[PDB]
């Protein structure tokens, strides 16, 4: 019920429509303390990847999972499991569908496109 | 009325404002860490009697900024130099005397000290309210003080404009001398929280010398709340009490003689 993850006791305020948010740990970020600020490498499938990696293999930037276009696609930040998935308001390599390594949608010419991302794993 | 209902994630909607809703709200939480920041926004048909406002405070090097703003008509929520003391209970900077300076960035926002204190027990209940907060801002009724307490809550706000006008020691309830008035305490509904046998006499402390009865709705899901206790003069007006108890459409009554505000002295409906 109190949304957060990792460390992150959650906090609210009676004055402002009792809105709730997270007080976050040193190594964490995000609305819900979800983003992992430290972690460089990925951990396997890269499914549980959280850290903040923006670009991809060709050097191009990921579109934000909350962007108007990525909202057309199958994986976006408006979906019920978005928190669980690691899909926030950001452009970070993520592997929600259990593909090989983490990816993200990347604007190429006129269409969003999956692109295997940067970020080597531990190896 | 219909307002724009935006979830925190970005997801919007258009909300048909329900019976006696009558206000569009946009609430904004903006956090700034060292060079680092985010912001959350909700939007919704809200209770009337709300109003534009702001709160901001240092906790560590983090700086939290609340703001909420309201407007009359349809889909209006749709589009886009003063010094104060600052601290919170997140990092216990308030209780541990780590008070920091906070320059207000606005003409209208003044020094603030807020006390939200719930007694209760443990789990579900006791809102996540920081419970000690100090910094720049503008809030209901303002420059002034008001408070309420009863057997299980103490709310207090101190609003003023002079350099570090909000300094001082942490304000705890048992640090405030009995004032001599005694008023019934209870809080819930005639079934629970304020049935005859849960409502009982208590010792008003500090500036809260009026016996209070408030009836309203409990907008976090209805049920039509009641609240009895020791109020300051101020809280007895302009529905400041709603904010403490998150209530809507409150009728409050304030008698200045000890022990009035007994149940059977009530006006009602
Ligand atoms: C909270 O603050 C808002 C003001 O900053 C305010 O919105 C004001 O609402 C009116 C309409 O009722 C707008 O009027 C506009 O119309 C007049 C001419 O009639 C112009 O002078 C203005 O330039 C403007 O176009 C205001 O624009 C609008 N102001 C803002 C900033 O949005 C809310 O109503 C306020 N709610 C409370 C409780 O104070
Ligand atoms: C009046 O307020 C006090 C708490 O300050 C309540 O008394 C305590 O009751 C709880 C649980 O019932 C005990 O665990 C505590 O030991 C008591 N603390 C003190 C300081 O006495 C009392 O329950 C209150 N009555 C209502 C209806 O809220
Ligand atoms: C008095 O208020 C309580 C809530 O404090 C109401 O409670 C509900 O009772 C139903 C079962 O009938 C439960 O499913 C809800 O979870 C309870 N909610 C709460 C908040 O307790 C109760 O119905 C109210 N009774 C009257 C007569 O108003």
DSSP per-residue codes, chain A: -----SS--EEEETTTTTEEEE---TTB-STTS-SBSS--S--SSSSS--S----BTTSPPBPPTTSTGGGTSSS-TTSTTHHHHT--SS---B-TT--SS-EEEEEETTEEEEEEBS-----
With CB atoms and an 8 Å threshold, state whether B10 touches A18. Answer: no
Return the best residue to mutate from B191, B198, B215, B227 for the ligand 3 pocket (most ligand atoms within 8 A of CB): B191
Please state the atom number of ligand 1 nearest to the C-alpha of residue B51: 38
* Nearest residue by C-alpha to atom 21 in ligand 2: B151
- Into how many domains does chain A fold? 2
Q: Which domain CATH number covers A52?
A: 2.40.20.10
Measure the CA–CA gap between A65 and A70, rounded to whole angstroms: 6
Widest CA span of chain A, in angstroms? 50
SS3 B61: coil
Nearest-by-Cβ selection for B55 from A15, A30, A31: A15
Measure the CA–CA gap between B115 and B132, rounded to whole angstroms: 5
Instruction: Choose the final residue of a domain: B63, B80, B97.
Output: B80
On whether the CB atoms of residues B242 and B227 are closer than 8 A, the answer is: no
Measure the CA–CA gap between B6 and B46, rounded to whole angstroms: 12
Verify that B264 and B186 share a domain, yes or no: yes
Nearest to B233 by CA among B214, B251, B210: B210
Q: Cβ contacts of residue B155 below 8 Å, gap of 6+?
A: B115, B116, B117, B147, B148, B149, B244
Measure the CA–CA gap between B78 and B44, rounded to whole angstroms: 10
HSE on the CB side for A51, CA within 13 Å?
16
On whether the CB atoms of residues B8 and B15 are closer than 8 A, the answer is: no
Instruction: Choose the final residue of a domain: B60, B80, B100.
Output: B80
Verify that A88 and A103 share a domain, yes or no: yes
Verify that B159 and B197 share a domain, yes or no: no
On whether the CB atoms of residues A72 and A84 are closer than 8 A, the answer is: no
Q: Which domain CATH number covers A35?
A: 2.10.25.10
Cα separations in angstroms, A9 against A2, A13, A33, A43: 8, 14, 9, 26
Measure the CA–CA gap between B17 and B216, rounded to whole angstroms: 19
On whether the CB atoms of residues B189 and B268 are closer than 8 A, the answer is: no
* Experimental approach taken: X-ray
Owning domain of residue B214? 177-269
Q: Which residues pair with A111 in a beta bridge?
A: A108
SS3 B64: strand
- Ligand 1 centroid–CA B157 distance in Å is 27
- Ligand 2 centroid–CA B268 distance in Å is 29
Tokens of A1: 């019920």
SS (H, E, C) B173-189: HHHCCEEEEEEEEEEEE
Owning domain of residue A85? 41-123
Cα separations in angstroms, B235 against B118, B129, B213, B229: 18, 19, 11, 11
Nearest-by-CA chain B residue for A68: B10
Strands (DSSP E) contained in chain B are: 2-4, 14-16, 23-32, 37-46, 53-59, 62-71, 82-88, 100-104, 110-118, 133-138, 144-150, 153-160, 178-188, 200-205, 210-217, 226-231, 248-255
Cα separations in angstroms, B188 against B55, B119, B191, B202, B243: 29, 15, 8, 17, 16
Show the CA angle centred on residue B156, arms to residues B153 and B160, nearest 5°. 175
Does B198 sit in the ligand 2 pocket, CB within 6 Å? yes
Measure the CA–CA gap between B199 and B168, rounded to whole angstroms: 34
Verify that A23 and A81 share a domain, yes or no: no
**CA A59, A65, A67, A71: dihedral to nearest 10 degrees?**
120
On whether the CB atoms of residues B25 and A17 are closer than 8 A, the answer is: yes
């Amino acid at each position: 019920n109190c949304d957060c993850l990792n460390g992150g006791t959650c906090v609210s305020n009676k004055y402002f429509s009792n809105i709730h948010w997270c007080n976050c740990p040193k190594k964490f970020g995000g609305q819900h303390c979800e983003i992992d600020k430290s972690k460089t490498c990925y951990e396997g499938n890269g499914h549980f990847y959280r850290g903040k990696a923006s670009t991809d293999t060709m050097g191009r930037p990921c579109l934000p999972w909350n962007s108007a276009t990525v909202l057309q696609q199958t994986y976006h930040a408006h979906r019920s499991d978005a928190l669980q998935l690691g899909l926030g308001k950001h452009n970070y390599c993520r592997n929600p569908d259990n593909r090989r390594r983490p990816w993200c949608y990347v604007q190429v010419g006129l269409k969003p496109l999956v692109q295997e991302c940067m970020v080597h794993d531990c190896a | 009325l219909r307002c724009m209902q935006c979830k925190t994630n970005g997801d919007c909607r258009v909300e048909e404002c329900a019976l006696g809703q009558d206000l569009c709200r946009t609430t904004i939480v903006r956090l700034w860490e060292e060079g680092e920041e985010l912001e959350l926004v909700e939007k919704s048909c809200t209770c009337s009697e709300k109003t534009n406002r702001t709160l901001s405070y240092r906790t560590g090097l983090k700086i939290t900024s609340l703001t909420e703003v309201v407007c009359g008509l349809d889909l209006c929520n749709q589009g886009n130099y003063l010094e104060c003391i600052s601290c919170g209970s997140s990092d216990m900077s308030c209780e541990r005397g780590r008070h920091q300076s906070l320059q207000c960035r606005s003409p209208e926002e003044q020094c603030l000290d807020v006390v939200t204190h719930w007694i209760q027990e443990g789990e579900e209940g006791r809102p996540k309210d920081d419970r000690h907060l100090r910094g720049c801002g503008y809030l209901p009724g303002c420059p002034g003080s008001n408070g309420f307490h009863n057997n299980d809550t103490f709310h207090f706000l101190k609003c003023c404009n002079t350099t570090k006008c909000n300094e001082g020691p942490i304000l705890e309830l048992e640090n405030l001398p009995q004032n001599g008035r005694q008023c019934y305490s209870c809080k819930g509904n005639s079934t629970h929280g304020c049935s005859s046998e849960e409502t009982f006499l208590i010792d008003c402390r500090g500036p809260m010398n009026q016996c209070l009865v408030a009836t309203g709705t409990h907008e976090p899901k209805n049920q039509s709340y009641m609240v009895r206790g020791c109020a300051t003069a101020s809280m007895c007006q302009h529905a400041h009490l709603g904010d403490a108890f998150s209530m809507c459409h409150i009728d409050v009554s304030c008698c200045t003689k000890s022990g009035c505000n007994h149940p059977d002295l009530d006006v009602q409906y």
